Amino acid sequence: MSSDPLQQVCDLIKGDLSLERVRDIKEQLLKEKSVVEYQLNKESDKYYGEVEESLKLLNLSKNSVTSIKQQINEVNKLGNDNRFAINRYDILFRATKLYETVNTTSSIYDRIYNFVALMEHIERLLVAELAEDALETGCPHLLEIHFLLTSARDFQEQVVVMAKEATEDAQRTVMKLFSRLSGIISKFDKLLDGLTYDIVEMARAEQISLAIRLFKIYDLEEREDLRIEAIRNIIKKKEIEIEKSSIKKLPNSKNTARLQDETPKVIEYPTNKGLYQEIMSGTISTRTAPRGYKHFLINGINNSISEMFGEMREKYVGDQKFDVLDNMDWIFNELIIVKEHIANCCPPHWNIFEVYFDQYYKELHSLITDLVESEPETIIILDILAFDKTFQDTLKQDKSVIGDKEKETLFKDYLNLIVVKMTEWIGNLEKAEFDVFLERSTPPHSDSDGLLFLDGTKTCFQMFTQQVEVAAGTNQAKILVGVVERFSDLLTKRQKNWISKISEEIKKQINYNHKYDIDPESITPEDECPGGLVEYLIAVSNDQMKAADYAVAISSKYGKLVSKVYEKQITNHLEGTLDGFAEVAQCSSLGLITLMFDDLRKPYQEIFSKTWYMGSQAQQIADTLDEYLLDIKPQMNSVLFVNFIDNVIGETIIKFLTALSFEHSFKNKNNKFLEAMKRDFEIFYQLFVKVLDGNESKDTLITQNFTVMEFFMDLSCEPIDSILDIWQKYLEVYWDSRIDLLVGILKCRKDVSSSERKKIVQQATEMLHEYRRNMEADREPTLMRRFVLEFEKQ
Template sequence: MSDSTLSKISELIKLEDDLAKIGTIRQQFLKEKSSVDVKLSTTTQVQIDAIMNNLANLNNTSAKLSSIKGSIGEVQKIHDQTISSVRDYDTIKKITMVNQFLSQVANLYEDISGFKKFLDALNQKISIELENLQNDLHYPLPNFMQIHASFTQARNFQDYLEVYSRNLTDDLQSIVYKIVSPMKKTIKLFDDLLNEGIQSLTEVTKVQNFECFFKIIAVIVWEEKQDLKFSSINNLHMNLEDAKTVNYKDFRGRPRNYKKFFFDKLRANLHEIFDACVEYYGNDKVQVYNGLDWLEEELKFVHETLDKAFPSGWKVSSFIHDVYYNRLHQFTMDIINTDPPAEDLLTILSYDSKYGKFVSEFGVQQKSIIGEELKENVLDDYLKNITNRMKEWNDNLIRQETKTFTERVSAPELFPHSQNIEDLDINNNVITMAIDINVYVLPDFKIPLTMLKEQADVAANSNYAKILVEVIENWSACYVNRIASFRELVDEEMDRYMSVFNNDRYLIKESKAKRLFRKKPPAPVDLDNLSPEEQSKLSREGLIEYLAALANSLELSDDMMMEKFAPAYKEKVHTNYHARITKAFDVASESSSALISEVLSAISDIIMNDLTPALCKLFSKKWLEDGSSQTGEPTTANLVVETISEYMGEMRQYCVYDVYELMFRIFLDNFIPTYIRIGYENILHGDGKRIDPHATKKFKSFSEGISRDVETFFNGLDPLFTKKDAEYFFSSLHAIEMLAELGTCDPNSIQEAWQHMVLPKFYDCSVQYIRGVCLCRKDMDKSQVKRLVPVLQEIKTEYHKQVEPPQTTIFTLNDFQFQD
């Protein structure tokens, strides 16, 4: 008994009470035994059945192997019989060859006797088919395949007779020649029919006559394969069959090259079409380029439709494109060799670009119809012609503008101008206002842009981005030269003006000792003793008006150039050229903007020159006492405001707003540091009163005088600004206003004032601004100031490390300097 059985019995009988269940347990074991016996019997039967099936399969395999063994024996028997019967097969082969020869002789007799008649009938069929195709593009060539089959049979017969008559006597060869000579006419007729079909391929396809098209192509393809078969057999030396037994109906003695014939005739036809176009225009051959729309339509049809119908390996579209390109190239070279004028060269260049772009749409590599090397020469010649012409125009314009500007016979021209400007409403929200004004401009100020438009439009029509870009670049260079000429002209005119009206003699910039030993300056020109003609030679009137007209002209031109011309011409070229066009216009714009700033600086210098006699009294006893008398005499600040208002009021009437706005900023950045500088120098070298921080009496207090001037400037000049622009004016005015605090505060608090009052308002303020006011104070000596300057510079450096520059930078005190 197994351990598992004993374990199970021990589980069932553990106690004495379990002995009473022995009968039940016995019945349970009997049921389990019966179940196991049934399963065992079923499994055993399945295994027995499988064994019997395998034995049956083994018996079948044995029978098949016996059959195979018998078959191999039969094969061996047949092999032995074949080896022993070789002589019988040789006899049969010879008898067969004799029979074939007798049949060949009989067939040759029949074919030779009927060859002429056969060809005459074939010639008639070919002629009829040719005539029908010439008269009707819709004709489907219904007999063409039959004609080709008969024609091929005749050519095969001809080849057979010619090839195998080479070993015959001369007499027999002459007889063969007479037999096959009528074939020449048939070959010519068939070639004419095929040529007509080739020339008509495009047209029959356009009228949907695809049956005609495919029959012609099928014949060419078949002939190509037969030529390939012949060449392969010939190269492998497999054409050694006996002439007596060869089947001459399938014989080919040489390649017939109908595929080459196809492309040769197609090329000739394309040349004929192009030459007909050239002849149409007679002697005016350049007009051919304006009448090549048919060529573009033809190439488009070939690429989109015709090419797909041909076998892919033929590359018909590339072939047709190359044929037309070569013919067009030769035609173009013939014209160029006649040394045509620039206009004809541009026509050629324009079509060259147009042609290149057109064929590139179909994936064809662009090739110049001129030739790449010669094209560069033609482009260079054309550009040289255009640039020389443009330079000549620009030089003439500069001479005319110089004459107009220097002579100033009449006031500048008025030009109506509309623009939108930004301002602030009462709630400091940005608003836009439209203004219309007549501004001063130079006569014909639009000529440079007109010259650009004329030449650039012509260049753009050439479809050559290189021409357009170089025309723009050359125009930019001419524009920069014109700006440089104006710059010299402005400098010369300012020298003439200042030679007469310069008021620097009123200023005291040096100490008494230096002035004592300084060489005396030349005496000022006495205008009263000069005739009007002599005065006009020095400086004609109207300089400020013409300077304003120049600034307006440049500003208006710059707006049109950058807003209209630059985007328009960039759209006409590939993005690869955008950077060059942008750079050309930027260079012109930058030079123009720089001259505008210089012109406005010149106007600012003229205004400051007129202010000099009044400003020379700054920080003097008279300045401190301004307003104390009852005579009603205007104060220094009132005189300054009156002069500025007169100049800027006129500027506001005839200047473009952007010019006026920039003019006022340049003037403020000039006027305010000049006001401070002259005041410092008056104290240090002239009649100015050193600043007494403790003076409190009215008309003796420095801070009182500063506050008085600031208030006068604020009230007098504020009307000249929009609310938005006034912010810069107020910020600049702080430079003067802070002098009251810096001149009267405790010396020990100057560093704190520099850090917390000056630098937040003037981020990059010069240390000389503080140094000057300290030197002017009574309670500070030079040694104190000398020790203070490095400390101030260190504070400025640390401030810049900790604080970012403001969005709107005030430049008023950035470069402040004075003479001490």
């Protein structure tokens, strides 16, 4: 098969004739079919039982439900038994003679249409009672619902005026219509003056334990009675749409009609084809239809009386800047009290519990406009509406709260504010600091061993720690990252300015040392600047490490209530900066190494000439720079220090190998240069091992440079047949300084000639490049990185 030949490959992953591994491979197939039949077993069982209940209930309802509608053949065909038999008496004279006077409702319509005129003219004040509450009307379950039933007796002139639509006469709704002017709208609007003044009376801060009880009881009685009443009229168009649109829209008319059907199919003709589905008989039977807006259409004015009192309590200024939700959420507390008080009053309607969430539309929509733009206090924009979001949540079910959706755009306003503010802050703090550091007689914040902290950087520390209190205070993935990481771009502008003006500190000590001991024909205006750059630039690296303290240590110290993704998005650009927290040391402290130097450039090129060969130039270099690392040594930050003295032994050996191209013929002749490589090697040893005390770097960060010491002793002292292996070994560590240095060494030498430079130094050039294909495919550029000295014609 197309699987089996592939399965012949799967078992042909056992060999070709592999009967033991064919057996085991068959056991693997048995494991696969084993579990596939466990899950296919139980799954097939569940499907089978689903078919079992499926056909079991298709059975049970085919038979039993066929005997449920056929049990309606049993009991409903039993309904047809006593159709013209029952009630053992003159039922024919009960439904056609005693019920003939049921078609004789004349005098009740005259004294009740007339009494509906006069007494509801009286109930236009009595059942429309107000001024002020006295329990809301007084007693609007007596009063406003007396206007509801007086409007339900005038629902003969309001709802059964729509049932009596040309029943038998013309003045049943005309001469009684002036009896319905003071009859219907002096009872229905009396129930709506008592209903709008009931719910308005229920909008009156208590409101009350009997006023909202009676008033809301009328506004649930005539509210839900109105709901089933107009639901019985809409179910007279839906029971007529069920009934007359099963008659007119059978379809067997089949025109259908013009124009009392489609439209109004199906209503369809009042009294009684359009009425008796809401009228007699009809054990209701009007439908009621009181009161329409007791709270059937007037419960929206209660939750919109706390959501129009709430929305009215905004006072859109916001009366300090965001006090809209103060009085508005106060009306939300009155919405919870009026809500639960009214559900204690009225179960069916009249503000059961919707006043709370309607007032959450009042506080939500209210707080989403007081700080829509930056028109409120932009520093206090999201804290107010968010404080009412979570607090007005916690003041309720959490839920008459302030849903805002403008939190995050206002957090972009906090982005622009805190970021551009910290551009202003950071710029002033920088230029203040650097203009302090050019005053080189007093160091910053006191300690006598150069571990000084700073002042404006402390304002960055503590005061930017206070800038991110809204960041961590609201736990934003867009500010506590974004102000922090855009702030890290601001820190990149910082360390660029520490490179710039700390390089101007370097220039200041360069020409101040020109003023000190370096031939004073160099003097600049801003460089009147003696020794003392040590405490300044190390004070910088110290608050690089204290930017590690509050930036790194506060960073991972507080930010622990997101996942490590967003916490990590913070962590990408505050704590890799530890490398950055010596990267200024990549630019400051190398300047320190040259400013240990710049009082001493008179021996720095008189090396390789005859003065240093038997004199005290090595004394000045080694001992003076030794003391220069006998005062930076107490005064230096550690991460700056290891890299520092590392680059002191390195840079001081390349200032010990400065003058390899001055072409002074080497005094290995009478050993004057050679003692300058050997006896001065003792003097240039405690420049490595008295510079370094308190640690064991004395040769450890000097061994790599004893390579260029001893192999350079093999380069520049030794004769013809001992400069080959000089470039062998010196190639085996330092190919960064290339072969042509030896050419300069044979520029500084007569008694190893230029054809010897061809054989030794050019076959050794082939050693250099072919070993660079061989062994470098030695180590990095170093102190001897780009000191490939000039070569002649090989």
